[PDB]
């Protein structure tokens, strides 16, 4: 089993985001998104799968944060330029079908940040980046 | 906009189910799963899409409950006995690709029930079953 526990930090009062979708890809016997003490916990049956959280703000901004394990190491990716028909479940599957997304996954990043077109920053940093009990902060700018 | 507000009733203390995935299909400008007073609220951009809740019990039982609107009428379906690689995102997309699931959506049911292999009943009943502000009970036996 691999677990990734995510703590969400919102740093900027000009917006407020909230989770609107939580998906789990089908490889490695799947897994679950659960909540313990205000943290989102992705539990997966083995290496090679992942799960996507999609966040939406009142003002229309949105992004996906995807977390998983590839070849026994954590990975993550943030997508901020979501097409009109790119829900979380669409994005999560693309990591196993679209080359650019497959490459983002296979980089096994333990830290990544990117901005949206409005200039807001989003960051995922794993503070426990090793082993089977992984911990990451999702930090919204 | 269509909204489906879901209340989960668990009637049988021999198991405890809890939500482990919530997905939104990409048609009709997608939508969101939010929570208001322990109710799961699926808000959709218009008719023609849907969203899936997956529930797991710590005893191994699991099922998906999918809610949506097809040609302006609500629909619903429950799938039980899920395989390890049938996560909620896999099931949700099946309503637009797999024949028996497409037919289930086309039925535009205001209520549906089914049992799993163990004999446990699962039912969806829309208590507000018309118009744009729909309400359903998901009742686990």
Author numbering:
A (entry chain B), B (entry chain A): 1 to 141
What does the report in the manuscript say about this coordinate set?
Sclerotium rolfsii lectin (SRL) is a cell wall-associated developmental–stage specific lectin secreted from the soil–born pathogenic fungus. SRL displays a clear specificity for TF and its substituted glycan structures. In the current study we report two recombinant variants SSR1 and SSR2, generated by the deliberate changes of the amino acids incorporated at particular sites of SRL by the synthetic gene construct method based on the complete amino acid sequence of SRL. Interestingly, SSR1 and SSR2 the two different variants of SRL, differ in their glycan specificity.
Apart from the carbohydrate binding site residues other deliberate replacement of the amino acid is incorporated between SRL and SSR1 at 14th, 113th and 123rd positions, where the amino acids Asn, Glu and Glu residues were replaced by Asp, Gln and Gln, respectively. The crystal structures of SSR1 and SSR2 lectins in their free form were determined at 1.7 Å and 1.6 Å resolution, respectively. Like SRL there are two protein molecules (named mol A and mol B) in the crystallographic asymmetric unit of both variants related by a non-crystallographic two-fold symmetry. The mutations of SSR1 (N14D, E113Q, E123Q) and SSR2 (T1V, N14D, T34S, E113Q, E123Q) were all identified and all atoms of the mutated residues were well defined within the electron density map. Overall the crystal structures of SSR1 and SSR2 are similar to the SRL structure and the introduction of the mutations did not seem to affect the overall structure of the protein. Only, the mutation N14D seems to cause a minor disturbance in the loop region of residues 12–14 in both variants (rms displacement of all atoms 0.18 Å and 0.26 Å from the SRL structure, respectively). The most profound conformational difference is on SSR1 and especially on the side chain of Asn81 which moves away by 5 Å from its position in the SRL structure towards the secondary carbohydrate binding site. The adoption of this conformation of Asn81 in SSR1 is made possible by a shift of the entire loop encompassing residues 81–86 by 3.0 Å on average, from their positions in the SRL structure. The glycan array analysis of the variants demonstrated that SSR1 recognizes TF antigen and its derivatives with high affinity like SRL but showed the highest affinity towards the sialylated Tn antigen, unlike SRL.
